[PDB]
Amino acid sequence: FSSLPSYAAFATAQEAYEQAVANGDSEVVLKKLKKSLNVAKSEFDRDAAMQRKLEKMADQAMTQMYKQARSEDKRAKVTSAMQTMLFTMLRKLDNDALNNIINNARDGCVPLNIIPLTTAAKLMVVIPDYNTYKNTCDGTTFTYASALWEIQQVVDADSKIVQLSEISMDNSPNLAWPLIVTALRAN
Amino acid sequence: FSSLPSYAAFATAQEAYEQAVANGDSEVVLKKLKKSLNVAKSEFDRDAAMQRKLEKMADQAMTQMYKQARSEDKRAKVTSAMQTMLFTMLRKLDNDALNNIINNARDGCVPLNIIPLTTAAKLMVVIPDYNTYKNTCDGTTFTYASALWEIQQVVDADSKIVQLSEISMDNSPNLAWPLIVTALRANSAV
Amino acid sequence: AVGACVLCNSQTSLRCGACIRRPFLCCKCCYDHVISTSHKLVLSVNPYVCNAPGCDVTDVTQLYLGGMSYYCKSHKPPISFPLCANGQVFGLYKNTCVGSDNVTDFNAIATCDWTNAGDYILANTCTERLKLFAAETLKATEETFKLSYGIATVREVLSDRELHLSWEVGKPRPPLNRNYVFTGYRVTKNSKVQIGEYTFEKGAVVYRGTTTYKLNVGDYFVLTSHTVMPLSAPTLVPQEHYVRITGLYPTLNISDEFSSNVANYQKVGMQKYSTLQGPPGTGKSHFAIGLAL
Amino acid sequence: SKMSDVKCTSVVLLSVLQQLRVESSSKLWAQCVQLHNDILLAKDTTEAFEKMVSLLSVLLSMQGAVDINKLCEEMLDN
Amino acid sequence: PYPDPSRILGAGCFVDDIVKTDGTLMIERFVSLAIDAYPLTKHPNQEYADVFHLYLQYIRKLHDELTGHMLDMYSVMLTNDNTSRYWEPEFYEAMYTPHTVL
RNA sequence: UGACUGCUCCCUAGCAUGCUACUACCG
RNA sequence: GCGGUAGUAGCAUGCUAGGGAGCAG
Ligand SMILES: [Zn+2]
Ligand SMILES: [Zn+2]
Ligand SMILES: [Zn+2]
């Protein structure tokens, strides 16, 4: 704390008294010098701690306000944060069935109900283009979620039944394409 | 802190004493200066301390009385709210059936569990599944508590209207099953 | 909370307490906002006001930062340092601040009633973001001085297109044409109820029907306005002409019925933004289709 | 380490599903809660994975909900 | 007394509230959790002490993160006066030695 | 929508006591 | 020459009040 007038006064008094004492002198001069020195020393010493307490208190207050602002900010982005985190962990898991269904949904082939686990029960998906049908459906079997399923019904956007033999490269582009395959889980 | 009653005397004595010191007079005037200034500062000390104590005492008293006033205001508003709630719920007592069953008592006292059982106008039934449904409220009118009730509305756990034509054995697994049935007292109260 | 004061290029958490849009001003920037004019109240993450019960101090120039709180002048526990001191106001970003050379931007255009031509003059003598602040404040003043007039209502109804109309308590009436759509709401006992869109010009009160209506008792018509949110993208894009016709899907045929289209087609080939000054019949009818084909 | 990962992923997935107002359908919410509670009690890491597939199918079969493709282009899921 | 390590780790990893998935906002949670988990360092099994050591290292990391993360964008400079006591075992060893304090 | 107890850690404000220090009065 | 008294500053100790958090039945 060397930026206060009290420090300047105390330093000048210290220098004057020290020089006078080192020069050598009587008792009355020493007494007068110390009576004029100690008041300035106390004046300096009070502020020397008051300033420190003020500075640390200000630092703590700024810390607390930063923490409050950050918490208020954080509690307002939870949906996006959670979605990003979930997909990061889904990457890190690295499973074949999960990767299969995520890529299928990313290209457009999403399911319509909860995927069953038993050797029975119906599953319905939507196939929006011929390329997805070429990749997944070949023959009369269906490969989805790293499993095997058996096609039993095909329905178009007009809800008319389409037989499996109908679908072909050039024979397809005269149809309502968002097909709906309903299959059951092969053993 | 600058216009205290003793401030004038203290400052005037200090100024006069320091002028005498600056006059370069003998040591007796210096001793008188020192004594007078010492006693002046000593008397200024308590005048500067007691006032500061008193101000803080007064501030504490003001704060306490303000919070007391706020507490009284809150009490008044909660009293008004409770009175309003009681007088609002009073207006649905059906004061003819209640009077009819009160007068039959031999001294005016009746169990509380039989007041809704004999004077209520509406009945609500919660049904877990279809097997329980077909044994309790099958059809459009059923009997319970020695009275006849007729159905008025049926909703599901999601609070959406459900028609009785689709509450069947085949269509049972397609409903949010905690069904709620509402009926009215027939021939009696509503 | 944490926004942006950009003239001093300073992230801020402060804002002027009594102003147009709760504008964001940094420490020194809030300071010369509160000494060049009279705005002696600010808002931070928490508002600056003495925290003892029953106390009341609007001013900030004499508050102190006490024990994780704020205290004041008339009711003074002064074990603290003043909030407003040393050319700055206490807050975050108290060190990473620059200041403003043009001291009187807000002090000039945010201090008048937002109706003089000087507002628009300075708005055109601004930067892109400064003029964005200007435009948003013009929308704000439009709405805030539109919400100072009456609400028309039909209490007893007459034949459609000729009704009766009483208005409000003491307020004046705005201009008369269909500029202000009288699309209010109806109240049954506490709630708002379907009303439709109306407009009052002729008054016996003749109405123009944006829809066919069956007016009931009390039906109230007035424009109820929200406030336009701040925008995050610039208005105009800086002028940068293209290197080539790279990234285009060219065609073979050339428009012939339009006799001033081919050179302008090439212009769109290497022009980034395009404005012209024309009455009806300046390509607005056919040149858009010309580019479309 | 392959089991705690799937339990944490299941917790995050259930949180995401709850954020999308799924509990406004009692049957779907009951099924999701049952699956989530069954995953956390698993002991072997095959049943947990099939239940995880079943639970993720609920989120995938909601068209508007989220953007699978944007959330896959942010240096995230492949 | 010592608790089940799984309980301490579960309290560390699963929280109610969203604002408790940012350790810098609440460092006093982990101090209490490490107080509860101190006597695990005398257990003959080795992971049990590793729980306490992991908590101490996480506390130090959170403090360093706070100081640097606050010195960077703002210009407030933090001090490490009598804060290192929270990542040394002597502050926690004194809670199980018979001498009433506070 | 958030019960009754017990224990412990952290921060601030006040009170009481003690230690040291600096001036001043008194004998 | 020693002690007493009156303010002022720093430090330590125990309670009361307010706030944040942890564990147990
Ligand atoms: Zn202002
Ligand atoms: Zn600024
Ligand atoms: Zn005050």
Quick description:
Chain C has 293 residues and is α+β, with helices and mostly antiparallel strands. Chain C has six helices and twelve strands. Chain C has a two-stranded antiparallel ribbon. Chain C has a two-stranded antiparallel ribbon with strand order 3-4. Chain C has a two-stranded antiparallel ribbon with strand order 5-6.
**Total helical elements of chain C:** 6
User: What is the architecture of the domain at 97-186 in chain A at the second tier of CATH?
Assistant: 2-Layer Sandwich
| Rounded radius of gyration of chain A (Å) | 42 Å
Strand arrangement in the largest pleated sheet of chain A: 1-4-3-2
Total number of beta strands of chain A: 4
The proportion of residues forming helix of chain A, as a percent range, comes to 40-55%
Radius of gyration of chain C: 28 Å
Major sheet size, sense and barrel closure of chain C = 2 strands, antiparallel
Number of strands of chain C: 12
How are helices and strands ordered from N to C of chain C? EHEEEEEHHHEEEEEEHH
Ligand kinds: zinc ion
Greatest chain-chain interface? A-D, 32 and 31 residues
Apparent shape of chain A: rod-shaped
CATH homologous superfamily of the domain at 97-186 in chain A? Nsp8 replicase, head domain
- Strand order within the widest sheet of chain C? 1-2
Function (chain D): Plays a role in viral RNA synthesis. Forms a hexadecamer with nsp8 (8 subunits of each) that may participate in viral replication by acting as a primase. Alternatively, may synthesize substantially longer products than oligonucleotide primers.
Protein name (chain D): Non-structural protein 7
Organism (chain D): Severe acute respiratory syndrome coronavirus 2
Domain RdRp Nsp7 cofactor (chain D): 1-78
Protein architecture, described:
Chain A: This is Non-structural protein 8. Chain A: Residues 1-187 form the RdRp Nsp8 cofactor domain. Chain A: It is found in: Host cytoplasm, Host perinuclear region; Host cytoplasm; Host endoplasmic reticulum. This is part of a larger assembly, with two copies of chain A, one copy of chain C (293 residues), one copy of chain D (78 residues) and one copy of chain E (102 residues). Chain A has 187 residues and is of the alpha+beta class. Chain A has a domain at 97-186: Nsp8 replicase, head domain (Alpha-Beta Plaits, 2-Layer Sandwich). Helix content of chain A is 55%, strand content 14%. Chain A has five helices and four strands. Chain A has a four-stranded antiparallel sheet with strand order 1-4-3-2. The longest helix of chain A has 48 residues, at 27-74. Chain A is rod-shaped and about 125 Å long. Helices cover 19% and strands 9% of the residues of chain C. Chain C is built from six helices and twelve strands. In chain C, the strands form six sheets. In chain C, strands 1-2 form a two-stranded antiparallel sheet. In chain C, strand 3 (64-65) and strand 4 (70-71) form a beta hairpin. The longest helix of chain C is centred in the middle third of the chain and has 19 residues, at 128-146. Chain C is flat, with a radius of gyration of 28 Å. Chain D starts with a helix and ends in an 18-residue tail after the last helix. Chain D is mainly α and 78 residues long. Chain D is flat. Chain E is built from four helices and no strands. Chain E has helices spanning 5-13, 28-36, 46-73, 90-93. The two termini of chain E are 21 Å apart. Chains in contact: A-C, A-D, A-E, B-C, B-D, C-E. The interface between B and C is small, with 6 and 4 residues. One zinc ion (ZN) binds at residues 5, 7-8, 10, 25-26, 29, 100 of chain C. Chain E binds a RNA duplex (27 and 25 nucleotides) through residues 3, 7, 11, 26-33, 35-36, 95, 102.
